[PDB]
Structure formats: C-alpha cells, structure tokens
Amino acid sequence: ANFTPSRLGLVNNTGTGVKDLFLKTFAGEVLSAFRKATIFEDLHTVRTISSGKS
Amino acid sequence: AQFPIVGLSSTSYHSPGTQLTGNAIKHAEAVINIDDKLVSNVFIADVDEAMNHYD
Numbered sequence: 001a002n003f004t005p006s007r008l009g010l011v012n013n014t015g016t017g018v019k020d021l022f023l024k025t026f027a028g029e030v031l032s033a034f035r036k037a038t039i040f041e042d043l044h045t046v047r048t049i050s051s052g053k054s
Numbered sequence: 055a056q057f058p059i060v061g062l063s064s065t066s067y068h069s070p071g072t073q074l075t076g077n078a079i080k081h082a083e084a085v086i087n088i089d090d091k092l093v094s095n096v097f098i099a100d101v102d103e104a105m106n107h108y109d
Contacts, residue, residue: 051107 057084 007013009021062079 051105053105 055086057086059083 007018009019010017011021059082060079064077068074
C-alpha cells in the first residue's frame, strides 16, 4: 500500500461506494420460458385439404 | 347549382304627349342541392373464403 489511487467511480472524494458512477450493461443473452415436450404433434396421421368443411 | 329563368312582356296603346316609363320583366331560379354520398359495402371473412369452392 504505497499509492493513493484516483477513484473515478466515486461521486466525490468523500464517499464510501467506489462504484455507482459506472453503468449496468446488457449481458447479451435473453432468457425465456422452456418449450414443453410436444410428443402428440408427431405420432399421428396428418393430411391437408384445399376446400370443404369435412 | 342555379338555373335562372326569364320571360315576360306586355303591349299597350300610346297617347301622344306622354312619356313612356317601362314595364318590368322579373325573373326566378331553380336550385338543385347536392345530396349525401350513396354507398354499398360488404364484408367477407377468411373462414368462408377458405371453406368455399368458388370466388
């Protein structure tokens, strides 16, 4: 301990929190709810029609 | 829009020595106010469009 640093995150020279002049930043990854296992979309017969009600 | 209309006259005998004054031919007009806007509209859903077999 031989130096007196210039704390550039302090609001003045008369504080305790050496942070709080810095910013909170986006991490880069956004979380979201998981996708439930859809096992019945497959394992059945699928057909497509172009017109009609049944 | 306004349509003016004209037409009248008269005929009489004259006595010498007197001055003719005149006879008035007065007019009128016909006006045609413009009505509101006529419309005709319809709404077609896409369910019926998809379930149909003609346009």
